[PDB]
Design a protein around this motif. Structure first.
Motif, short mmCIF file in Angstrom:
data_model
loop_
_atom_site.label_atom_id
_atom_site.label_comp_id
_atom_site.label_asym_id
_atom_site.label_seq_id
_atom_site.Cartn_x
_atom_site.Cartn_y
_atom_site.Cartn_z
N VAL A 137 19.75 8.65 11.64
CA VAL A 137 20.43 8.42 10.38
C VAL A 137 19.97 9.44 9.34
N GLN A 150 2.80 14.08 -1.08
CA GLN A 150 3.55 14.44 0.11
C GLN A 150 4.46 15.64 -0.18
N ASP A 176 15.11 5.84 9.79
CA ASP A 176 15.66 6.09 11.11
C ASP A 176 15.90 7.59 11.27
N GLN A 215 18.25 6.85 -3.40
CA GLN A 215 18.03 6.34 -2.04
C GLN A 215 16.57 6.00 -1.78
N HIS A 259 10.79 16.40 -0.40
CA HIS A 259 11.85 16.03 0.52
C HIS A 259 12.98 17.06 0.48
N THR A 260 13.61 17.25 1.63
CA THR A 260 14.86 18.01 1.68
C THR A 260 15.87 17.46 0.68
N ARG A 261 16.00 16.13 0.64
CA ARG A 261 16.88 15.48 -0.32
C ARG A 261 16.52 15.86 -1.75
N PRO A 291 7.56 13.26 11.23
CA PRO A 291 7.24 14.51 10.53
C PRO A 291 8.43 15.41 10.27
N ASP A 292 9.63 15.05 10.72
CA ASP A 292 10.85 15.78 10.38
C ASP A 292 11.67 15.06 9.33
N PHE A 293 11.06 14.14 8.60
CA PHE A 293 11.74 13.38 7.56
C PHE A 293 12.39 14.32 6.55
N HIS A 294 13.66 14.05 6.24
CA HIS A 294 14.40 14.81 5.25
C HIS A 294 14.50 14.10 3.91
N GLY A 295 14.02 12.87 3.79
CA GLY A 295 14.09 12.14 2.54
C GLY A 295 15.15 11.06 2.47
N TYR A 296 16.00 10.92 3.49
CA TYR A 296 17.17 10.05 3.40
C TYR A 296 16.98 8.68 4.04
N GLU A 344 0.82 -1.20 0.00
CA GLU A 344 0.00 0.00 0.00
C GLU A 344 0.86 1.26 0.00
N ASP A 345 0.28 2.34 -0.51
CA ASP A 345 0.93 3.65 -0.45
C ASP A 345 1.20 4.04 1.00
N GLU A 346 2.36 4.63 1.24
CA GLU A 346 2.76 5.08 2.56
C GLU A 346 3.09 6.57 2.56
N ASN A 347 2.66 7.26 3.62
CA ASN A 347 3.03 8.65 3.86
C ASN A 347 4.28 8.66 4.73
N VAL A 348 5.39 9.15 4.16
CA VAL A 348 6.67 9.12 4.85
C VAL A 348 6.68 10.01 6.08
N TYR A 349 5.86 11.06 6.09
CA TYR A 349 5.85 12.01 7.18
C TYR A 349 4.95 11.60 8.34
#
Ligand SMILES: CCCCCCCCCCCCCCCCCC(=O)OC[C@H](COP(=O)([O-])OCC(O)COP(=O)([O-])OC[C@@H](COC(=O)CCCCCCCCCCCCCCCCC)OC(=O)CCCCCCCCCCCCCCCCC)OC(=O)CCCCCCCCCCCCCCCCC
Ligand SMILES: CCCCCCCCCCCCCCCCCC(=O)OC[C@H](COP(=O)([O-])OCC[N+](C)(C)C)OC(=O)CCCCCCCCCCCCCCCCC
Ligand SMILES: CCCCCCCCCCCCCCCCCC(=O)OC[C@H](COP(=O)([O-])OCC[N+](C)(C)C)OC(=O)CCCCCCCCCCCCCCCCC
Ligand SMILES: CCCCCCCCCCCCCCCCCC(=O)OC[C@H](COP(=O)(O)OCCN)OC(=O)CCCCCCCCCCCCCCCCC
Ligand SMILES: CCCCCCCCCCCCCCCCCC(=O)OC[C@H](COP(=O)(O)OCCN)OC(=O)CCCCCCCCCCCCCCCCC
Ligand SMILES: CCCCCCCCCCCCO[C@@H]1O[C@H](CO)[C@@H](O[C@H]2O[C@H](CO)[C@@H](O)[C@H](O)[C@H]2O)[C@H](O)[C@H]1O
Ligand SMILES: CCCCCCCCCCCCO[C@@H]1O[C@H](CO)[C@@H](O[C@H]2O[C@H](CO)[C@@H](O)[C@H](O)[C@H]2O)[C@H](O)[C@H]1O
Ligand SMILES: CCCCCCCCCCCCO[C@@H]1O[C@H](CO)[C@@H](O[C@H]2O[C@H](CO)[C@@H](O)[C@H](O)[C@H]2O)[C@H](O)[C@H]1O
Lengths: 56, 99, 62, 178, 459, 607, 170
Positions: free
Chosen positions: B29, E427, B26, E81, E430-432, B18-23, B9-14
């Motif tokens: 990390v 969404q 964790d 990534q 991303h910063t990335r 909610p401080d996800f930077h995309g990398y 299923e589709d996932e919302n990364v945030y």
């Protein structure tokens, strides 16, 4: 320092050691190619007082 | 039908971070991957690489060539010689065929 | 007078002879077409308003 | 915009639409209100003289000839209300009509600036989640047996039920959003 | 070059000996530092090109291509990534190793002093490229894309191998410097005309030349993003770089041998740019845009003028950064809705205002807005072609009009209009992702500030 | 030359600071629209010093601030031509822009992105000053393309509106067709003069400059919206009114005339180019005057007014009067910006209503806006001693008394009376007559951010022409000897145009129904040029892209003839050679054939 | 500064002035205010900078290249001799480019300086630009992207043989 720390951070010497070793091999390449040092038409000259080679 | 997983299923990364930077999923990390990219990519390469390039002297001998040109223009004019001649090579150095 | 249609300037519906046809064969087609549209609209809206939808709506026609 | 069109327009609907267009294009020609009022009354008299035509086949022919007459006497550049299709302000604010589901991505520091708004928004989300299953069942129950279907939706029959498929209507962006 | 190549080789053990949580942070950071070291090649204070050894050199043509190659590796890693985060740890490391392998091979390719060495490294790149496309591409058509890519290249490369052996048997060497100084006029025989084509076809297929370009739209639509980045930015430039190196020995036959390839390129650039107006797939649109741009590179190399070579060098670098940026921008929407259909997501400026700014600059770069290096390269190519024949401006003029049309068409379709609001999975950026866009666009602006660095060999 | 040079460079620096602040976090702790208006206001004040030093000594400058890159024997330098054309356009453009930017604060007060709107207007002004001060063609091309992109962004400001995005791309397309001519001139001059610098290009005076001058003329045709490339300018009214006041009436649309003014030393020795400009201008000045007579959108009437005044500038260029065509750019900038401001004042108060058929009685209910509207219309129509008189009257004198194409002469005078007619159309239907707007009246024209900017341009529309006319150095020798009917032709046809229109407008009140004659439909539908060209041309070209380029070739025949025929051949060869029976008897027979063949070849090749 | 011989500038000839009107000239007063508020503080900063420079005075030198044998004196296939000769030719070609740039710079400066008189008072700069352009075309025109000393020599010999043929027929 600590086997848990060192087992994680020892890899930080690989690329720097590749650079230093890469620089060392490049100087060895200079040494094999000195057959015209101070012998070209354009640049040859008399050696300065305490000078063994014009470039190294 | 064969035995195959359903599509994920589709996932919302945030949603979780909610401080996800995309990398990375964790958080610790994630922030350090963000810092390394910004530090090495921008603070080091883009700033110092730009500085180093800016202070490469006489790139492809462009400064020497203009300096040499002014010297020759000066010389060729006080002595009355032409500024630039048609023949690059002195004709005395050339032996044409007899025919 | 009179309007002559062209491929890049088409015939208005109000001037179209087929818009003023009331034969039961045509009215049955028109009702059948709306039934298809209405069923497709219902399927779309059920997906659209569903509060558990997490992703965009797949579009098989596209 | 709020009501879906039917499968076909009845003869009366087509005549009344020509009447509205005819007056509106007359208004564009006349400009002045006194002149428009004079010719608006003359226009109504022409629709009245054939009001009681019972032939149908003649009535349909009278509709044909009027529509042909309209196209020849059409104003090339008719007046359009600013917010209507083709008007100058049409879709002017669409770039400001942000859907409500965007707020689900707001950062907690962003949400903390409207503590009261985001408490009410939770109540509206809870209301939406509870009502969905009943809404789906009602539409399934009210399907007609014969395939003939339309885009009209039913109301809520019982008590505590919300009308089916209400969220995209009720929560839509304002006309003037910002 | 060894002080650049050896640290690059050390990225492979670094990848495999890192912890799973440190691999990306490690390899990306040192990849940036290796890009920094490649700038040493720009320290050129004279007009003698750098010959480090019998094997490796660097001159004003290879130096920009080497640095651009070094810069792409970190950028490709950041791009990869997010879509690899479901692969297990060994599969992630295998992917990184493929990316490092191309970086190593390409840097060696652009610094090779001998043509069969160039050929071996030139051919070696196909292996990691094919693996990336077919193992990590998303669709079933990735396998067909792999076949076209591999065999369009190989069929042209075999004649190149024959020509290189033939030249070496006749001259006694394939060293580039000696071939330059000792070159003698060719006779205009049928045998020499076939020699010209054997020397040119592999480079022309790689550009790609119009007519043999079908492999490239297929390869881009099916590749993962890091594959698209390297393919559009660097791999196409192997053909142009190959043509410039080898054409020194082909005179004077290029004066008449070039006509069919100037014609295909000048007409072909109109066919491929006009395709972009009616392309439903965003990746395919960007890919056809590349074919149109590389047609200009082909034409200017074929006419062999100082301006034409300089305009081609700038365009090679400018297209490299611009097209890689466009693929990354397109991939950011795809990672959200998983479709490449351009007309699907719409009005995105409403929800991604800063990403829309990156879109606009990439589009402005692509339609060659002055004073960008994109415009500078295309301008000097236009001047050289006009000199070659004043009627070339007619085809140039048509392509300029069409390029503006599709460049702005892509922006209007995807960024403007009403938001497609059923897409609740949009969404925030991303910063990335925003960093990745900046790493493309800052160098483009910095190179516009100092365009002496990418003028090439003739100026 | 230090104070002069410093002033020229300081104007750019002041205009960049609003752009610089936008990139910082300081933009949200200041009143950005107010800060940007002050920066432009000061920049206008600074620009008055180089204007004064030029009016005194008339000295001209070539200023080089930065060496960009040397391409062998071609140096590209950021350099500035600070001459009569550049010094006076800077002062006029900064003054007008100061009014537009203050007005935008009142006009776009409700827009949530006012800061971006203000930023875009500033960028447009920077690119326009790069365009008018550049000393070389490449630097000029930076400004030339810069204003194109900024106009695209400002026309399509309300980007959710499909019609705005269509109008934005239309402006890009027509101006890209013009840019082909600009590049043609650039390539020609770098190959024939080895320079894009104007000083070195001046030594092309004796050459045959038909190819490059035809290129500049095409570039000007697109950029100034002359006939052929004209339709985008009325379509650009999709943008917010301050965009139309600044770009598409005062500054951006005169870049084409300005380019041809810069290259006037070369166009003077080419009669073919002079003839083409004269006839192209005359056709545009008439065609767009006809279109304006039956328009109902107030912004479209003023847009077509602009195209008609640009046509008159092109006619002036065709008569070999480059300084008169430039003096009309400066005077035109005042009353046209005011006209757009005053209509934006009306549009705003009547709830975004632009149709003149729902206005009326503005002379009584909006006294200030109406008074400035009438002042602007009288300046446009050549009312004596207002700003328009001091350039337009000389233009009409010059055309009457010069060797000129006689159709060009006639339609230029017909279009001048037609100017009075469509000015009367606005005055009659907007300021006179009875109310025709919705009954809830909430008109407010009391904001200082509205009244002061208009009042500043009303003064320019009264006195600017006189002050400029008496300060500029003498240029072309005017012909002041002519019959009385040639001297008063401009005044007579203007007054006649008012009476004809004033008469024709009164006939609209008689209770007789208007019909659609074929001549008015031509005017209303813009000669059908958009309804045909904008349908057939994109349809044919877009159809070929799909059917022929993509489908017939790339997806079909390039596939069929190269990769797919190769695949078929080797599959066919594979099945013919691998379909073996596995019978040892058949293989041994085939080995017998091999043996016989080898023995035959040996025998025949036996010496 | 610069060499007034390489980059010649005519002496200035500025009139009196001889004002007639009694009004005050605003440019005169603005310049005095400018020379106080702006010029004077800027000079002090520059003089401070120049004082620091003299305490750390370093020098740099213009590099001199001794002539090497021309391509005419190289045996064909002699890569060592060809290399040095070719590198010499590239150095000279570059210096020729900058001589063209100097002559065009004089031409552009003179045109601007002469204004409406440029068609008469630029005759010497326009003639030098014409001569120096002829000489440049003879050395370098049509050599191509792979220009070199060998191609330049072949181009010269082709021209010399044609000049000789034309003279012999005379
Ligand atoms: C360094 C760090 C960068 C700091 C970025 C920042 O913080 O800005 C915040 C600022 C405000 O934040 P935001 O509102 O949240 O951003 C949302 C959207 O991005 C909204 O952003 P936006 O659309 O409002 O503004 C972005 C703007 C892009 O950025 C600009 O501000 C325009 C700069 C134009 C060029 C320079 C002036 C001319 O886009 C444009 O308008 C494109 C106009 C193109 C003009 C073409 C003229 C080119 C010829 C001139 C150059 C040659 C000189 C010749 C001299 C002779 O955002 C930006 O300006 C864009 C940030 C992206 C990086 C910008 C890089 C620009 C480099 C110069
Ligand atoms: C916009 C550029 C036009 C698209 C390019 C194109 O397909 O034209 C090919 C054509 C090729 O010739 P063509 O016009 O005969 O192509 C076939 C067209 N049909 C199928 C309609 C018969 O070239 C042109 O003439 C374009 C001008
Ligand atoms: C980004 C760009 C940043 C630009 C920053 C510019 C800063 C300039 C610094 C120079 C300040 C000089 C001030 C000054 O005049 O006095 C300095 C002072 C000198 O005083 P002074 O300049 O007033 O001296 C007067 C002149 N004499 C000496 C000849 C009588 O420096 C000192 O502190 C004393 C050491 C000498
Ligand atoms: C001989 C060798 C000479 C060169 C030595 C260079 C320095 C190597 C050490 C740098 C790493 C420091 C230790 C480390 O691992 O960084 C920790 C950081 C976060 O890791 P974490 O597990 O989340 O711990 C949280 C701590 N607050 O994790 C990180 O993100 C660190 C990222 C490291 C990136 C590579 C560093 C390159 C350093 C420049 C090389 C100079 C040559
Ligand atoms: C526009 C705003 C200006 C922003 C940049 C300002 C930075 C700066 O100071 O650059 C000025 C300098 C110009 O120097 P110069 O080329 O000599 O000018 C001509 C003669 N005056 O320009 C420079 O020297 C800087 C040149 C940029 C150097 C690039 C830095 C590293 C790039 C990372 C790799 C990515 C690029 C890959 C392709 C590169 C090909 C070589
Ligand atoms: C890409 C990043 C680059 C980072 C750049 C960092 C560069 C640092 C700059 C240091 C410059 C100063 O460098 C220093 O200058 C002095 C001036 O006193 C010079 O020194 C030389 O000349 C001076 C003149 O007085 C003598 O007194 C001295 O004995 C002699 O060695 C040298 O040049 C160097 O010793
Ligand atoms: C002169 C320089 C250029 C020369 C280059 C020549 C390139 C030759 C490439 C050969 C391509 C081989 O391609 C191989 O066969 C065809 C190509 O149509 C593909 O076939 C594909 O299309 C066919 C229809 O045409 C389908 O029925 C099939 O299911 C599908 O796979 C194969 O999947 C692929 O494996
Ligand atoms: C000098 C050599 C240069 C050419 C290089 C070699 C390129 C390869 C060409 C021969 C092989 C490709 O072969 C071509 O593609 C595939 C096989 O892959 C076949 O296509 C087939 O693929 C699969 C497998 O059988 C089937 O499911 C499919 O329905 C069928 O179309 C094509 O019918 C054949 O024409």
């Amino acid at each position: 320092t600590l086997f848990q720390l060192l087992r994680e951070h020892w890899v930080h010497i690989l690329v720097p050691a590749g650079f230093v070793f890469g620089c060392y091999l490049d100087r060895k390449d200079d040494e094999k190619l000195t057959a015209f040092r101070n012998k070209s038409m354009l640049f040859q000259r008399e050696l300065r007082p305490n000078e063994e080679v014009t470039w190294k | 039908q064969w035995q195959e997983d359903p599509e994920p299923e589709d996932e919302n990364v945030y949603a979780k971070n909610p401080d996800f930077h995309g990398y990375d999923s964790d958080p610790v990390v994630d922030v350090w991957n963000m810092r390394a990219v910004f530090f090495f990519g921008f603070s080091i390469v883009l700033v110092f690489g730009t500085t180093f390039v800016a202070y490469v002297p006489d790139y492809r001998m462009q400064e020497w060539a203009r300096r040499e040109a002014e010297r020759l223009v000066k010389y060729r004019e006080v002595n009355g010689l032409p500024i630039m001649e048609s023949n690059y090579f002195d004709p005395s150095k050339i032996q044409l065929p007899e025919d | 007078s009179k309007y002559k249609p062209a491929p890049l300037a088409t015939l208005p519906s109000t001037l179209d002879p087929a818009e003023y046809d009331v034969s039961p064969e045509t009215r049955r087609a028109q009702v059948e077409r709306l039934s298809i549209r209405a069923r497709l609209k219902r399927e779309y809206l059920l997906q659209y308003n569903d509060p558990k939808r997490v992703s965009h709506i797949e579009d098989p026609a596209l | 915009a709020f009501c879906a069109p039917p499968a076909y327009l009845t003869h009366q609907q087509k005549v009344l639409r020509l009447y509205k267009r005819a007056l509106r294009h007359l208004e564009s020609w006349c400009i002045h209100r006194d002149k428009y009022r004079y010719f608006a009354c003359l226009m109504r008299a022409r629709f009245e003289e054939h009001k009681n035509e019972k032939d149908m086949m003649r009535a349909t022919q009278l509709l044909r000839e009027a529509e042909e007459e309209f196209w020849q006497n059409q104003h090339p550049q008719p007046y359009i209300f600013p917010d209507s299709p083709g008007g100058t302000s049409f879709e002017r604010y669409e770039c400001y009509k942000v859907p409500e589901w965007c707020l689900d991505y707001w950062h907690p520091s962003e949400k903390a600036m409207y503590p009261d708004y985001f408490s009410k928004r939770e109540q509206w989300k809870k209301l939406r989640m509870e009502s969905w299953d009943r809404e789906v069942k009602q539409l399934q129950e009210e399907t007609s047996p014969d395939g003939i279907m339309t885009e009209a939706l039913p109301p809520a029959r019982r008590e505590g039920d919300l009308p089916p498929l209400w969220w995209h209507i009720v929560t839509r962006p304002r006309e003037r959003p910002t | 070059m060894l002080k650049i190549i050896l640290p690059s080789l050390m990225l492979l053990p670094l990848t495999w000996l890192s912890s799973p949580k440190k691999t990306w942070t490690n390899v990306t950071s040192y990849s940036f530092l290796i890009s920094l070291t490649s700038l040493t090649l720009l320290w050129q204070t004279d007009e003698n090109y750098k010959n480090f050894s019998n094997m490796f050199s660097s001159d004003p043509l290879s130096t920009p291509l080497i640095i651009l190659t070094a810069w792409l590796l970190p950028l490709m890693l950041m791009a990869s990534q997010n879509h690899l985060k479901k692969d297990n740890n060994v599969l992630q490391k295998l992917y990184i190793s493929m990316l490092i392998s191309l970086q190593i091979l390409l840097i060696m390719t652009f610094s090779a002093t001998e043509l069969i060495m160039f050929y071996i490294l030139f051919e070696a790149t196909l292996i990691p490229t094919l693996i990336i496309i077919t193992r990590w591409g998303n669709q079933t058509e990735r396998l067909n894309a792999g076949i076209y890519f591999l065999f369009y290249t190989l069929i042209g490369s075999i004649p190149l191998l024959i020509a290189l052996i033939l030249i070496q048997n006749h001259v006694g060497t394939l060293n580039l410097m000696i071939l330059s100084f000792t070159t003698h006029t060719l006779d205009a025989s049928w045998s020499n005309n076939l020699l010209w084509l054997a020397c040119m076809m592999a480079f022309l297929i790689k550009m790609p030349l119009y007519g043999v370009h079908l492999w490239l739209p297929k390869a881009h639509v099916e590749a993962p993003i890091a594959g698209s980045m390297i393919l559009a930015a660097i791999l196409l430039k192997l053909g142009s770089y190959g043509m410039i190196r080898i054409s020194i020995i082909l005179d004077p036959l290029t004066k008449y041998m070039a006509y069919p390839f100037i014609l295909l390129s000048l007409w072909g650039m109109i066919m491929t740019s006009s395709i972009c107006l009616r392309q439903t797939d965003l990746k395919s649109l960007i890919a056809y845009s590349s074919v149109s741009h590389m047609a200009l590179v082909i034409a200017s190399i074929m006419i062999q003028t100082p301006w034409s070579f300089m305009g081609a060098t700038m365009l090679m670098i400018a297209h490299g950064l611009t097209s890689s940026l466009l693929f990354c921008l397109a991939n950011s929407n795809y990672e959200r809705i998983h479709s490449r259909t351009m007309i699907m997501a719409r009005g995105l400026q409403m929800v991604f205002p800063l990403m829309a700014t990156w879109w606009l600059m990439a589009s402005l770069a692509n339609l060659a807005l002055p004073p960008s290096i994109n415009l500078m390269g295309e301008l000097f190519i236009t001047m050289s072609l006009f000199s070659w024949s004043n009627f070339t401006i007619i085809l140039m003029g048509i392509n300029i009009i069409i390029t503006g049309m599709y460049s702005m068409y892509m922006i209007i379709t995807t960024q403007r209009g009403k938001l497609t609001n059923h897409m609740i999975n949009l969404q925030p950026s991303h910063t990335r992702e925003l960093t990745l866009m900046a790493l493309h666009m800052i160098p483009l602006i910095l190179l516009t500030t100092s365009p002496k660095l990418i003028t090439g060999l003739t100026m | 030359m230090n104070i002069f040079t410093t002033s020229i460079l300081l104007i750019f620096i002041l205009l960049l600071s609003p752009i610089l602040i936008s990139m910082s976090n300081l933009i949200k702790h200041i009143n950005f629209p107010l800060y940007t208006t002050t920066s432009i206001k000061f920049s206008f004040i600074i620009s008055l010093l180089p204007l004064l030093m030029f009016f005194h000594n008339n000295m001209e400058y070539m200023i080089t601030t930065w060496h960009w890159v040397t391409m062998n024997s071609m140096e590209l330098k950021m350099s500035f031509k600070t001459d009569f054309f550049s010094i006076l356009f800077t002062s006029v453009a900064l003054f007008v822009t100061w009014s537009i930017m203050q007005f935008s604060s009142w006009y776009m007060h409700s827009d949530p992105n006012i800061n971006r709107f203000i930023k875009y207007l500033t960028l447009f002004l920077i690119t326009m000053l790069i365009l008018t001060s550049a000393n070389n063609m490449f630097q000029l091309f930076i400004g030339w393309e810069g204003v194109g992109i900024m106009s695209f962004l400002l026309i399509g400001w309300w980007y959710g509106r499909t019609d705005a995005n269509t109008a934005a791309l239309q402006a890009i397309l027509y101006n890209r067709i013009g840019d082909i001519g600009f590049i043609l001139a650039m390539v020609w001059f770098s190959l024939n003069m080895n320079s894009w610098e104007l000083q070195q290009i001046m030594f092309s005076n004796n050459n045959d400059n038909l190819i490059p001058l035809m290129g500049l003329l095409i570039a000007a045709t697109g950029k100034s919206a002359q006939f052929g490339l004209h339709p985008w300018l009325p379509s650009a009214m999709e943008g917010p009114t301050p965009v139309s006041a600044l770009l598409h009436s005062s500054t951006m649309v005169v870049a084409g005339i300005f380019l041809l003014v810069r290259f006037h030393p070369l166009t003077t020795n080419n009669n073919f180019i002079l003839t083409t400009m004269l006839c192209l201008g005359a056709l545009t000045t008439l065609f767009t005057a006809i279109c304006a007579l039956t328009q109902n959108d107030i912004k479209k009437i003023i847009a077509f007014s602009t195209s008609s005044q640009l046509g008159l500038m092109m006619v002036t260029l065709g008569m070999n009067q480059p300084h008169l065509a430039f003096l009309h750019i400066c005077t035109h900038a005042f009353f046209k910006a005011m006209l757009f401001m005053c209509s934006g004042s009306i549009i705003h108060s009547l709830a975004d209503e632009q149709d003149i058929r729902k206005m009326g009685n503005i002379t009584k209910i909006m006294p200030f806006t109406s008074s400035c509207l009438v002042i602007g219309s009288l300046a446009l129509t050549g009312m004596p001693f207002l700003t328009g008189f001091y350039s337009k009257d000389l233009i009409i004198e010059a055309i009457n008394t010069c060797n000129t194409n006689a159709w060009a002469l006639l339609i230029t005078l017909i279009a001048t009376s037609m100017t009075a007619m469509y000015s009367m159309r606005i005055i009659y239907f907007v300021t006179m007559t009875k109310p025709r707007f919705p009954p809830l009246i909430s008109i407010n024209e009391n904001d200082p951010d509205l009244m002061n900017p208009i009042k500043r341009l009303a003064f320019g529309s009264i006195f600017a022409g006189f002050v400029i006319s008496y300060n500029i150095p003498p240029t072309s020798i005017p012909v002041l000897t002519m019959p009385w009917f040639l001297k008063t032709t401009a005044l007579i046809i203007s007054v006649l145009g008012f009476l004809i229109a004033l008469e024709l407008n009164n006939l609209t009140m008689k209770l007789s129904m208007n019909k659609a004659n074929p001549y008015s439909s031509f005017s209303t539908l813009l000669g059908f040029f958009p309804s045909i060209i904008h349908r057939i041309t994109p349809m044919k070209s877009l159809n070929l892209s799909l059917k022929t380029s993509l489908t017939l070739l790339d997806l079909i025949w390039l596939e069929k003839t190269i990769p797919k025929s190769t695949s078929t051949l080797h599959t066919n060869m594979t099945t013919l050679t691998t379909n073996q029976k596995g019978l040892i008897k058949l293989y041994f027979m085939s080995f017998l054939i091999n043996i016989i063949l080898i023995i035959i070849l040996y025998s025949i090749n036996l010496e | 500064s610069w060499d007034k011989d390489v980059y010649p500038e005519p002496p200035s000839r500025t009139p009196a002035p001889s004002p007639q009107t009694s009004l005050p000239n605003p440019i005169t007063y603005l310049t005095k205010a400018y020379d106080l508020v702006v010029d004077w503080p800027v000079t002090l900063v520059r003089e401070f900078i120049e004082r620091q420079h003299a305490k750390n005075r370093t020098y740099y030198y213009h590099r001199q290249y001794r002539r090497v044998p021309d391509i005419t004196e190289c045996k064909e296939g002699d890569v060592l001799c060809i290399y040095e000769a070719e590198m010499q030719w590239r150095r000279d070609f570059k210096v020729d480019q900058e001589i063209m740039n100097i002559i065009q710079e004089r031409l552009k400066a003179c045109q601007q300086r002469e204004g409406e008189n440029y068609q008469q008072n630029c005759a010497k700069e326009l003639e030098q630009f014409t001569k120096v352009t002829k000489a440049y075309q003879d050395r370098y025109l049509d050599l191509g992207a792979y220009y070199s000393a060998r191609k330049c020599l072949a181009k010269q010999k082709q021209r010399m043989l044609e000049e000789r043929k034309a003279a012999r027929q005379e």
